[PDB]
Amino acid sequence: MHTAEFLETEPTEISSVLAGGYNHPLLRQWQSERQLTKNMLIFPLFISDNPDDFTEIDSLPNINRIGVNRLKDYLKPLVAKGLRSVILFGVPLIPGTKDPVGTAADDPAGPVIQGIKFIREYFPELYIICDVCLCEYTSHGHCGVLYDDGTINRERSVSRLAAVAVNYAKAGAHCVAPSDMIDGRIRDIKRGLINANLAHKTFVLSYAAKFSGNLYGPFRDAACSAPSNGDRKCYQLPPAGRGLARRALERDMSEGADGIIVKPSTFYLDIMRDASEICKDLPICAYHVSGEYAMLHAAAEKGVVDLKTIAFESHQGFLRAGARLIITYLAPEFLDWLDE
Amino acid sequence: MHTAEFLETEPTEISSVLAGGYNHPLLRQWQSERQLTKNMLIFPLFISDNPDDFTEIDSLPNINRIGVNRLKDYLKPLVAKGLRSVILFGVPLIPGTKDPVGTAADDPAGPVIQGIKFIREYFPELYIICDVCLCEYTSHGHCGVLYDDGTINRERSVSRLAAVAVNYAKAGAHCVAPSDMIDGRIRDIKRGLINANLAHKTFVLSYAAKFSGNLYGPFRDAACSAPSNGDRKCYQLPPAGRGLARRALERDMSEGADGIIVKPSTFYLDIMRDASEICKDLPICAYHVSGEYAMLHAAAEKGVVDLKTIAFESHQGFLRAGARLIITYLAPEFLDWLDE
Amino acid sequence: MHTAEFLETEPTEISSVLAGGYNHPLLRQWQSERQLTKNMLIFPLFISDNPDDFTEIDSLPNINRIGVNRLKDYLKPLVAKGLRSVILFGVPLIPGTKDPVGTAADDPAGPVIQGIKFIREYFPELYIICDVCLCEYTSHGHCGVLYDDGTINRERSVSRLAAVAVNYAKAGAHCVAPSDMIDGRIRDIKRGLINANLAHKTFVLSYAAKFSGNLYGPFRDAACSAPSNGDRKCYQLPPAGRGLARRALERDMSEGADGIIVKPSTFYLDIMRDASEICKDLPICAYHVSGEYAMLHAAAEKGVVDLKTIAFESHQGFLRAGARLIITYLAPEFLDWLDE
Amino acid sequence: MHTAEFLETEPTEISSVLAGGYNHPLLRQWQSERQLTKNMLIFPLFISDNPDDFTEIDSLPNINRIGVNRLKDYLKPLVAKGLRSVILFGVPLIPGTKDPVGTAADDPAGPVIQGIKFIREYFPELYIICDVCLCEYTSHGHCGVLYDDGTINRERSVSRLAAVAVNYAKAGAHCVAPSDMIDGRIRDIKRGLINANLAHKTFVLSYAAKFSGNLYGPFRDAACSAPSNGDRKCYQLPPAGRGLARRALERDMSEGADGIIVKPSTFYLDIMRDASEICKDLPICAYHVSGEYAMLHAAAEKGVVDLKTIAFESHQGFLRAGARLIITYLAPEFLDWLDE
Lengths: 340, 340, 340, 340
Ligand SMILES: [Zn+2]
Ligand SMILES: [Zn+2]
Ligand SMILES: [Zn+2]
Ligand SMILES: [Zn+2]
Hints:
This is part of a larger assembly, with 4 copies of chain A.
Chain A: H1 25-30, E1 41-48, E2 54-56, E3 64-66, H2 71-80, E4 85-91, H3 111-122, E5 127-132, H4 154-171, E6 175-178, H5 185-195, E7 203-210, H6 217-223, H7 242-254, E8 259-263, H8 269-278, E9 284-288, H9 290-301, H10 307-320, E10 325-328, H11 331-337
Parallel strand pairs in A: 1-3, 1-4, 1-10, 4-5, 5-6, 6-7, 7-8, 8-9, 9-10
Antiparallel strand pairs in A: 2-3
Helix pairs in contact in A: 4-5, 7-8
The structure holds zinc ion (4 copies).
Binding site for 5-aminolevulinate 2 (chains A, B, C, D): 290, 329
Function (chains A, B, C, D): Catalyzes an early step in the biosynthesis of tetrapyrroles. Binds two molecules of 5-aminolevulinate per subunit, each at a distinct site, and catalyzes their condensation to form porphobilinogen.
Binding site for Zn(2+) (chains A, B, C, D): 133, 135, 143
């Protein structure tokens, strides 16, 4: 007969025994270096320049493009469940708005600044973050100002972006989050806020390690920000570029970032870990991007994973890797799930 | 008129300028610290105890359960395209096989050892890795031997697992990969190989940082390994347990691991980065698990991502985070994609 | 009788046993931290100002001095076998060309810029690196502009070199590689590219740790760059000067280098290892120089080593020591050897 | 006219200026972290079991196989020029000497122990190192005792090697240098010396990081040590195996090594640098092996390099990389060159 063989053992070495630390549900919580709380959540808003908009974005589940006259009813229940922060993205749809230098990015009449004034008035305790970039405002869809050859013009771009950021701060935004990845834009934005006497009031949340890749699809629908001719690979970091990401983190810290974003999130958890050493004294934020989000919904719909389960697994992942803040389209779900 | 404002700039600081390093496609390759090659790929095989099997696994796209009489035709084209390694999982379906101590795990008549002898004869240059565990062989589906209260019995389990590993080595396997996560099993497996005069011939590839979670669904179908009563949370590591994972990596290195696996992969890239310091002198392997794989297919089917694109993005992610080996169900695709 | 004595042993300690990790050919590959691929290779070209040249260089085996009208036939088969990058060296032989300030270094009529325009037109996917220095263009053969006492004039030299580098970039070179070792030339070259709006397009590949020594003999024949009166020991680093090399690496990184070269290679592998810490976020390139190359051929011809074997041994050495790029006269051989 | 362009400069930054440190020949000496002295040199001797031998080794320039009756005349002038240490290799040519367990390795009648007694008597101040291995004594030419399948038997090999080392110590050798690379042999050799009351008298100089490769050709002629059937790749380290080398250095230190050898030398300078951290408290020795030596002679004969120049360049390389001792076939040359 084939019988079950058992090799002769030596006494257990104490160094082998890890199991005492995780044999109860409370312990598996004790083992986290950071626990998820509601105040860590940052929820993106896509604000339309049609005040009555509430448009479904087909590729971005359960997220809409919203005008100002619809914001109050949308946000009231979220704030009531403990939402503490939002990140605004403007989506100007009125024709003849977009141009080569993103003039409308800081249009006082535009959806972001209108959105800021609305939220400061109706939800004065909400912390307002504004994305800073030109892509939702340029005729060509790139994140900066271009040379004639279509490559990015660094100096003009950071000059423009610094203006936009300061103007959002002047309108009332508490935080600016430059998502452009153009060399040296943090220095100029910080200098701009210093010159405007707003640097002591305005958190600079840099998208310091933001990678090019395949996970921004549904965002392009929500924000109508797809590039015209070419792609973003000469400024967004290459997925394999750990060295570049490390240098970008150091750079933006040095140039005045109060916090940094790693983007995408799950697919770049190692870069959050890198950032947790380089930027150990700064808050680190994970951005759970449109494609990562839509991927979780697609897999859950197919029965591969359970939505709530993998949402907790992925978001706990961010905290494990060193983040303490999360920008996520699942914020409404978590404001309910974290009660229980 | 609202006009485009441009703040006054200072001269560019050289420290700001990263763009010289990634403005051409060849450079975005120069920026990787490791490039993907075919010899890094390890392909899982699910071997049936019905020699004529070639059964589709509904939840695991394009992967089948295969008996020995079908292996040659399956593997010939893969080896011809450069496959260098396989990892074997036995799936014994004959009734009255499974028992409380996983007797059949090392049945010389069983699919793993038959699979080893087949591959050594027909594909003598293929490197054979065998998964080592009891879950595919226990009546209760857990990875070790249980006490009456249903908790894991450490000493009996590692005694049994050491036997299994040595027996696979004795049959011809080049490498054993214990996936059980039971405290101290590497020491006993290594001592077992030393006593059998096989330690100088047998690579010990420990699943050192293997987490409990929501991503093993489709594997349970392929391997018929689902637990009976309870789950694996008292031995698989808690997703938030970075400290435990760090300690597990150190432990298994100390107890004789020649290499380590981090599992799952994408959702645990930060742990690969941790491992790349702790286990800097050892090969690190990412396991792209059944649920991560099925998730990529589900999202691609929904048009969220492009399959090939995100496959390269995710697998490049592993290398970026410090892995130099990848166990992946996408090995056949990559053996074609890496030619081009 | 003298008989074979065997001392009494203790049981094997697991910590002693390394052999599990390297007992199979696939494993000895798993043990490399980086594998050699074709896209890592950079091949030097010596371009003549006689368009029809294809002159053998007696001291540099299998390498010729080539004019532009012969380039297409020379490069077509190499690119077809996967060559991705070249490094250009100009060799102007027309009398009355060389002068004390290396005027011809950036002659639009000269072999480098002609070579750049030829390659951009006929091989538009090739990545073009240009050596930047004055030695192939000065009447005196030194790498910079001299004072009357014959010592290097730093300020004038870096002023001239910055111009040359920018002019090559303006002509189409993707990368400039200053090989002069004159203090602070990287800062000025980078500032020059920034002022010319080319820094976002031009990789600066500094020969940061370049040593004086006995291994440049055959290069002096190919490039007709031998100094007049004196040697290069006051700017090329002394072979024993680890401290200086460490400081040079830090300096050039700080002044804008996107990548660094260690030169020579095999005889300075320890400096590559130093560089892999100091410049961990940057690509590191080994230059397998003329004398190291000619040394391998001489020893192989004498039957001391096998050419292919020691070529792989030495080039794997570079990767082991932390390089991820290799400038090597053996590129044609490797474009064939890496297929197999 | 094409005229020499000079870009506008900024004032020199002090951080750019390294040249103050190496503008004079005395300074290029000040810049070495260690200077070459005669007492750092260790000279290999190949001792024949024919007492009157003085046989030229065709592939090893200027080195002979020497019997005991010729030793005095050979060594007298070397010691007179300051030779402080030798490393002995036995070359028994009498038929019926070699056997599967290397019985003759510690034959009191054999060339090593005769060589030890000769040198202790006639040159009592010379420091005697003995190579410890079985390859010059086994019928099959491998470095240890084999199983029937021809693979190395670890336990028997280290048992035999420990005996040999202790027996050389008992005969008068001051130092034993095990060159076998078999797992755990240092522990057993050290325990053997402790049991023999010789550990307080006997330096253990481990060849801890000894690589397989193409550079041992001429040694095989001198020592008649070429393997029978197979090669040494399952115990000598793979050239790409930095991780293994790091682990081997740590291991042998832990098991009792008083010093370590890195072998080969020039082609592994990065491993010396690794060793200088891992083994910072221990002397590190470079072995300039037969093929590296013969390579320098071949290139010098071809006029690629100047022999003396490259000998100093390479040996200074060892010291730069962290060695403080050098085993080298060029010791006679250096005992003359270091006077001047
Ligand atoms: Zn943008
Ligand atoms: Zn299991
Ligand atoms: Zn030069
Ligand atoms: Zn030996």
